[PDB]
């Protein structure tokens, strides 16, 4: 019962027990005779949830009266993970529930493993939305997350014979205690139809899909604040009879499943429908809440667009103000731009949403007309500021010409937003300098940086309570909602006990993850090895492939000199591949196949293990990240906007090996470059290399160890039953590699040698770790959010506790 | 008020605790307060408050069964027409007055709250309401009984009347979340479909799997502390491009999507067949699971499977399949267990009702079951052959296999062969089964054939829907009659009692004002409450003859027009019921009713003397409102078409006199009451099949009955559809030439009989005394008496109304 999980006071513990028993009986209709482990999880979940209620009501009532500006974070994704521990942490209930359950004869962490992940996003962008909700409640902001209640979230990944298999993430199977259906605020959303023009346009003859809101509570850190995440579910409105009833399914498919498209644009109509569906229901809801004139609307409303996915909020808001509220165009436009702000999360051109004009015409005719009008007026502005610059107009247009004419939704976002932010300092500079150069020159004021962050509740206190406690023993608990106070730990770098303690905590965390693997997959790793972890979505740009070349280097090095001591490593790679990304699925197969060889070679044994961590998701991040020694963050310079997994490893006691890319650059600046394992090409070096043309063959012909690996790849060493299985990886690396894996091979491998050298010295490893944890405070999402609040949304955060 | 004796004790301590928990639920369960709670939130808070009182009894009851290990009764039905649960739960736990006082003190009218609840309309009509009455009675009689069926997402369609026509809306009854169900996800089971048969014995492989997830609804008995279970299965795709595959989960899940609105009409849809196997497979796995908590010799001593019609007939081949292929019993042994476990209830004699699945469809969907059926059939027919040697035509007739262009399996024959007992649902029905419909089977196995006359629960169909009637009865004879309905016989000694006569007429009148306030409030339909309420509510079929009621209504109109100054007993004629969505004829009949109303209700000469009104969306909750308001119960099916009926019994119990034919359970109602107390007209069974032998000619009646000939000419000419004058050409043609149900044959006697109805209505003392003579003898038609018979005569269990601790 560590101090940071609070007090287990006698009375409180007794009332919790009574209440657990009450819910098990009345809510779950069980007694001890026939209660399932799931029943006990649900009994605890309800007990804890009861403690949210009064605060939820009191919070929402207090906003209605204080009438503060309201913040609407609009996102296609909210990667929330589990809720039970988080609620307990934020309500200071953890120790008192852990003791209630003990006394009832139960292991509460066993009960916590029963909870399904709320996996309603893909990775970085969606988890960022989740951390943001957390931080906004902690900083007392009148904030709402708005999104889709997908029936199926990010697919569960199963590894079968070394390959990714996808299964439906049926996360709602048993019922969700942490949502509250609000069918009373159900709203109609419109599709197809056509437009008539007269004292204005009227969108008629539409098909209707109902949007039914489900509310989830979002508790702040011990401040008695509970904000709301509102997620919309699709409902049909109210051959022959039977087929008609079954065809209700088609409309309800809109909220069925999360598109597992991570930083890649697919152009599916059903995707477009999802985007409009969230956008229309949400805006109606915002407008209903504002009327409780529209001059004051941007004074009472901020809409933040998480990437371009909710971009139709710009034309939807215009459509509502102009056709329904009957405002004049320019006043409606003025209101829209002051309301709306856009976050860009990637520079990768294949990520960019470019909707076919034909498709928008059919589904959202009135919106397509508004987009053209917006385009017309915006380009008139470009023409006036830069007269006769024809190619600029072409480049900046919301309309892209071609065989298939498209709308570029990023450009629409820029046009319709008073602020455009990137998500780390270098990424935001890249936008001004390159990607959005033209827009920046027209409207330099628009462009901002907001470096990403993570919540220190889920990402420290919850997942690594032991680290949290040894920090709190030295500096108290204030840091948990004011993470810059972590700097105080720098005064402890020569403290013998703190050094011992930091290493003991990592050891216990490593032991813990080892038992997890042993228990759930019958997979044993040795906890007396350096845990080398690369967890994140499988993409070429993230270069799991560069990591693979490293592992094979380590293996071939052992085979060359088998009697030479090497620092034993357990190299763990984890993450999901998009179901239509051939090359990414081939990378998963490669990792397991190296695994198949390295793990069964008797000359290696325990000196090196290579394991693919199945089903990487938020709850698994919570387990592996506190156990990591080395955080792999090796994207090609310029390709990773920010990254947030990087911040998580820093906060939790791993040292980072990485490029100067995304937020890695800021992490290294906070900790000191001396305390970081920076390697490889900078953005300038990649550009110089693109100016001369990248020739992977040059690296192959002069780097002996790289040539050996590639010939093992092509020849069948890592696939003896199917010797040509990796011909596509080899061909891509040698002739079509957008991300220049070979260009960073040498420096990466050398820098890995330094990591190992440092690990042979446990005291200096630990001191360096302390210098990293100590400087991670900047990567709190409370800092990120305060910045958004003060520089974009025009509100002031407060951590002041509610009555 | 209101707070009457039969509704129990509103105790101070109980009322204060109920109000506390209501407010707790409003806050913690519903996340509301008084400022913003909706009238629906208030329904939900009450529903949770009441539901809580079921839990101790439910856990205790099911634990009692596990310890005592009684024979378990599994009532298998594709339908359970349960209606609403909140009032029935309160009635059965003696909580109504306490909750009405609690909600009263909270500033809430409890009746207004009840009216928020959706019907659970998981049935069509008689068959499905019968299953619901039976679950009620089985819990009141302390049987260890489970009803097993499908949780359809969409029950029986909600009917809207638009332009005088039926329109069908999805019955999205789970919209706001169902508090009277408990998901039982640990008991999820896999059901297999398609695949093929392999041989090592036999083995069914390469199947597509659909998960069956159980939802349990509590079934409280009448003040005995017993709470039984209705377990309903929901379809769930298993968890093994990508986007289309996730969406294609919809296909499997469609199995539990929607109740087939076919009322006595076999349509032969593969989707229907999947529903039938879905329930059967999950249920049977569950039964076997619970039994093993393996010697199957005792299996029939611990399990009864009652088949509500043939819809769950696959229960026979499935039990064989599990016992032979999975449990490796030998075939003869498995058969003896099956037969001894199963019993079959037939609900109608109409040939189009009958399920005959094509062999091609069973082959593909259920290949092992078709083999097991052909093997079942072979040994049945070897027995038939050994009993009646040389009778080749009798082999053809009794075969499970029907020959033809399209080869089919007769599921009724399957049911007879595989059941130790086969029953009809009213005396005259069970005899028509032995003497004709299943004549050959009755000759082979006379021991098998029984009667079980239908019943209705007097909880929902008296105490719930007509508390005033239950109260004036209780004042005279006490409250024991609620679960021992034959005690209503004591009221016969009150047929001359002036205060009882007065009281019965007072309750009827009060129920009439009530129902007229309902039409005024919910629609804007005006009806005169000092008119005779003439009510025909039931599913719309040619065989019920809403059309013969129609000819009578027009006769009355035309009688008034001929003699406008002649007094006539004022009437509000009400017809209600749903048409099957592709039955063109039943839809046309609904339209004709509204059109007759459009003329009659608008003719200034008529006004309040005769109104013709179509009751929209007839369903269990409407029946509870209108049946207590009825003065005359129309039960006019053609002789030998209506197996039993149960609405008939409802009207009898609630104080309506009955005009009907000597068909189904009408025969027994007139015999319990005395036929002098019963408005009987028309052809008997003899007279129908007598008339089928000589050939029925409807033109012969028309040529001789001038008032009938004026009606038909109003129809054809367009008097009742001046805008579309030939709108009703189809109905005239059918009546003139293609009437299977002999509408003109009974018209003369029906109209005459109706004159006796009116003549008696003009004598309210004697109207009322006849009513008393009817309520007093309604006892036989309690489903308590029905279930007692099923238990002793079929299941081998003794019922008990002893109270559980
Ligand atoms: N919301 C509805 O419209 C009505 N309703 C419920 O609210 C449902 N309560 C919840 O879901 C629920 C209460 C909560 C407190 C939280 Cl802090 S989170 C959360 N969720 C119970 C229920 C049971 C059966 C039918 C309906 C309902
Ligand atoms: N479905 C489960 O296994 C767990 N679970 C529930 O069963 C749900 N209680 C009921 O449905 C429920 C309790 C009842 C008493 C009755 Cl007498 S009837 C009835 N029904 C509360 C809940 C809330 C949120 C998530 C899950 C759940
Ligand atoms: C934080 C996180 C991410 C993002 O990690 P990156 O390394 O920045 O790509 C993706 N998935 C999960 C489950 C995470 O927790
Ligand atoms: C009782 C009942 C029936 C059966 O009525 P019959 O007249 O016997 O066909 C049909 N529907 C409902 C709603 C009923 O309650």
UniProtKB/Swiss-Prot annotation, chain B:
Record-listed Phosphotyrosine modification sites: 194, 215, 442
GO molecular function: glycogen phosphorylase activity; nucleotide binding; pyridoxal phosphate binding
SUPFAM superfamilies: UDP-Glycosyltransferase/glycogen phosphorylase
Gene3D superfamilies membership: Glycogen Phosphorylase B
PROSITE patterns in UniProt: PHOSPHORYLASE
Activity regulation summary: Allosterically regulated through the non-covalent binding of metabolites, being activated by AMP and inhibited by ATP, ADP, and glucose-6-phosphate. The activity is also controlled by post-translational modifications including phosphorylation.
Maturation and modification: Phosphorylation of Ser-5 converts phosphorylase B (unphosphorylated) to phosphorylase A.
Necessary cofactors: pyridoxal 5'-phosphate
Residues that coordinate or bind AMP: 33, 66
Recorded GO CC terms: skeletal muscle myofibril
Any Pfam family hit: Phosphorylase
EC numbers for this chain: 2.4.1.1
Catalytic activity: [(1->4)-alpha-D-glucosyl](n) + phosphate = [(1->4)-alpha-D-glucosyl](n-1) + alpha-D-glucose 1-phosphate
Site (Can be labeled by an AMP analog): 146
Residues modified as Phosphoserine: 5, 399, 483, 716-717
CDD domains: GT35_Glycogen_Phosphorylase (cd04300)
Alphabetized UniProt keyword annotations: Acetylation, Allosteric enzyme, Carbohydrate metabolism, Glycogen metabolism, Glycosyltransferase, Nucleotide-binding, Phosphoprotein, Pyridoxal phosphate, Transferase
Function: Allosteric enzyme that catalyzes the rate-limiting step in glycogen catabolism, the phosphorolytic cleavage of glycogen to produce glucose-1-phosphate, and plays a central role in maintaining cellular and organismal glucose homeostasis.
Subunit structure as annotated in this protein's UniProt entry: Homodimer. Homotetramer; to form the enzymatically active phosphorylase A.
Name used for this protein in its record: Glycogen phosphorylase, muscle form
Organism: Oryctolagus cuniculus
Lineage: Eukaryota, Metazoa, Chordata, Craniata, Vertebrata
